[PDB]
Each structure stands twice: as C-alpha cells, then as structure tokens.
Design a protein around this ligand. Structure first.
Ligand SMILES: [Cl-]
Ligand SMILES: [Cl-]
Lengths: 212, 213
C-alpha cells in the first residue's frame, strides 16, 4: 500500500519563506492525486488550506501556495507569521482512496523562554473521607513545551503512583501539563510534607503541601 | 461556513453507531464530502468519501462491508452508518470537504468497558499559599470513562483566570483532569466560586462550591 511521506519538522523566522514537500512512496505525483493540505492547530479544528493541488480555500491568506515540483506536491509560506506555527498534513488521492501523510510541524521562532508556574493542591477533605488521597501538581505558562517532574516524600524521591500528562499548548502559545500523585490516606499523614519539583531548561521550580 | 457533527459515543464491540454531519453556509450539493478519523497518538486515516449526488462512494479497505456513507442534499446532512464496530475503530471522527474547516469532530469509543461517572473534589485555596496577591482554587474531576468532560465556573459567567487542564490517562484506563481559576485574595471572602462538571457519556452533572479551608 502506498504511503505519503512528509518532513517531520521545519523551523522558520517571521517573514521567512517555508517550503513543505509531499511525495508518494510509489513514484511521481500529478494533479490526478488532488493533493490537499490540511492545517491543524491545538484547540482549533482541522482546516483545509489548499485543495486540488493548488486551489486556495476561501479566507486562506495568500501567502500560502500549493503546486507541483519535481514529481512532488509542495506548499510554500511566503513571509511566515507566528500564527502559521502549526501542523500541516498532506493527503493524496490514489484512484480510489485518500491517504494522509504524517504531518509537518512548522515552528516559527520568536517566542521567548518562559519559566513554569507550579500550583500544588493537597488532598481535599472530601477525598480523604473516601479513603483516597491524590496530590495535584499543575504546571502552566512554560516555553518551550518540555518539562520533567519529580516528586518527593519529605526529602526523598518517590516514583510509585506518579502519572504525568504530555505537554499541551495554551491559548497564549505557552504550554501546560499536570502531574498526579496517588497516595493512601495513611501515607499522606505519616509524612511531614510532599513536594512537586518541575525542571525546565536547567532550572527547577518546587511546590510543597503538608497535612492539615 | 459550519460543519456540526453528532452521533459518537460508547458502544460495545460488534455494536453500531450512526454519525451525522450537518452542513450550512455553503452549497452542500456542490462538494464531495469525506469522513476522516484519528485515534489518540496515531495518524490521520481517511475513512470514506461521497460525490455530489451520492452515486459514487469509496471506502478504506479496513471498513468495506461494515461502514456506509450517505448524504441528503435536501437536508444538507452527511451520514456514516457504522456496523460491526471493532476496537480498532476507536477514534475521533471528522467530516470534511476539500476546502475549508473540518467539523469539530465526534468521539467514538468501541470498548467492552462500561461508562463511569467521575468524582468531583474541591481544590480549596489558602491565603498563606498565594503568589503576588493572587490565589488559586479549582476542582478535581477524578476517575471517569470515557472522554470528554466539560467544566465551567459559576455557570459560564466566570471565565477570566480559568484554566482547565487536559486529562491524564491512568494505568487503570480511567481519566482525571483538573480545572483551576486564579483570583485575587480580596475576592476570597466576597465572591462565590462554583465549578460545573458535566460528563455526558455517563449522564453525570455535578456542581461543587469551592471555598478556602
Ligand atoms: Cl512552537
Ligand atoms: Cl478541603
């Protein structure tokens, strides 16, 4: 079965010219493959930017262009804007079906580095009555979107019962994540305190909660 | 232009679901329409398409004999009848045309596990645990299946400072998320904060008032 091959990732500056390529594993691409470029942003539905190789969708900025070159389908962005930082998927029609590529992550440089803000919540009184206890560590407003989390029972590490989310992009183009530590009610009260440490770009941010 | 989808839900293996895509703001009968799905962590998979009058329909081989795409130009509606559902059919399903925005997507879960309503616990703030005069309170929506869950504050009137986090997938298969709202300390004793959790798959609507410990 034919597969659609895209670049994994590209980086540009604001005002730069990007060219994304889309090739078939079986050979040459023509207008009979009706190449479709679909843009995906976090918290925004997919939207088709280019159809039938080169037809711009209504409202799509004219800096996006699609065409064929060297037997491959291509999408350029002439004068890229920060709002173009997104995932771009290619789809090719093979006579009887569409096949989507893996998508290209386009990064527009310029976003300044931001340290993570950490908020830690102890188990509520309601949950402790249900013989449960969970620590909620909330990490927000960090860029680039990558953090590591380590928990501490008093001053010693603890790995059992830790579940952390992948980083997700916020509306302000920064990233967020959360980490949950599950504990018995007895373990929560037998220790002096628990800590959630978030490491980002060599710096670590810490938050501490204590039984009340 | 808009494409609103509906019909997704939880269904046991071998069951059936019927998706619907309501089209508006454009000449629906002029365009081919597509069904596309994406499972969490996996790539986009084209499922099926249909021509203007509905005389031509194509399907991915994984789907032939089980799904049936149809359309009603008089009602501007696109349908996807899904029979003999398999665990591999679990994905977010999108209706789309060649140009313009896709639908918001509806979630289809094919699993032998039953739906479970979440537990909601308050995340009470503390005046001694602030940061520059701002407090932080929230709600913990724990142990539900499957996605999604909606959370609002004060019945939608409170939106400034609200931050709802994407859910974590626990090893048990249940989800948990938290929603947080940051507000000044002076509003701790004058304003009322209530989170509205809704888990439609289990028909569970819980309201929790959040106040300091
Ligand atoms: Cl980025
Ligand atoms: Cl409490």
């Amino acid at each position: 079965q034919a597969v659609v091959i895209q670049e994994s990732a590209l980086t540009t500056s604001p005002g730069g010219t990007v060219i994304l390529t889309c090739r078939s594993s079986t050979g040459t691409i023509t207008t009979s493959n009706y190449a479709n470029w679909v843009q995906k942003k976090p918290n925004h539905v997919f939207t088709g930017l280019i159809g039938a190789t080169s037809i711009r969708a209504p409202g799509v900025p004219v800096r996006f262009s699609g065409f064929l070159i060297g037997g491959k389908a291509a999408l350029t962005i002439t004068g890229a804007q920060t709002e173009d930082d997104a995932m771009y998927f290619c789809a090719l029609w093979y006579n009887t079906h569409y096949v989507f590529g893996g998508g290209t992550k386009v990064t527009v440089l310029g976003q300044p580095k931001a340290a993570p803000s950490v908020t830690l919540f102890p188990p509520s009184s309601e949950e402790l009555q249900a013989n449960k206890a969970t620590l909620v560590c909330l990490i927000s407003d960090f860029y680039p979107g990558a953090v590591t989390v380590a928990w501490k029972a008093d001053s010693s590490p603890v790995k059992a019962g830790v579940e952390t989310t992948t980083p997700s992009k916020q509306s302000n183009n920064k990233y967020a994540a959360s980490s949950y530590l599950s504990l018995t009610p007895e373990q929560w009260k037998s220790h002096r305190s628990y800590s959630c440490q978030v490491t980002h770009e060599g710096s670590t941010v810490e938050k501490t909660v204590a039984p009340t | 232009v808009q494409l609103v989808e509906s019909g997704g839900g939880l269904v046991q293996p071998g069951g059936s679901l019927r998706l619907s895509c309501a089209a508006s703001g454009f000449i629906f009968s002029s365009d081919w329409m597509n069904w596309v799905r994406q499972a969490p962590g996996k790539g986009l998979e084209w499922v099926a398409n249909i021509n203007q009058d509905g005389s031509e329909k194509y399907y991915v081989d994984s789907v032939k004999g089980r799904f049936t795409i149809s359309r009603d130009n008089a009602q501007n509606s696109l349908y996807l009848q899904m029979n003999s559902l398999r665990a591999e059919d679990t994905a977010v399903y999108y209706c789309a045309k060649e140009l313009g925005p896709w639908g918001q997507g509806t979630l289809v879960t094919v699993s032998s596990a039953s739906t479970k309503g979440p537990s909601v616990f308050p995340l009470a703030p503390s005046s001694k645990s602030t940061s520059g005069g701002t407090a932080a309170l929230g709600c913990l929506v724990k142990d539900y299946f499957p996605e999604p869950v909606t959370v609002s504050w004060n019945s939608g009137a409170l939106t400034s400072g609200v931050h709802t986090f994407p859910a974590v997938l626990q090893s048990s298969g249940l989800y948990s998320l938290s929603s947080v709202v940051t507000v000044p300390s002076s509003s701790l004793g004058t304003q009322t904060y209530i989170c509205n959790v809704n888990h439609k798959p289990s028909n569970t609507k819980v309201d929790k008032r959040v106040e300091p410990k």
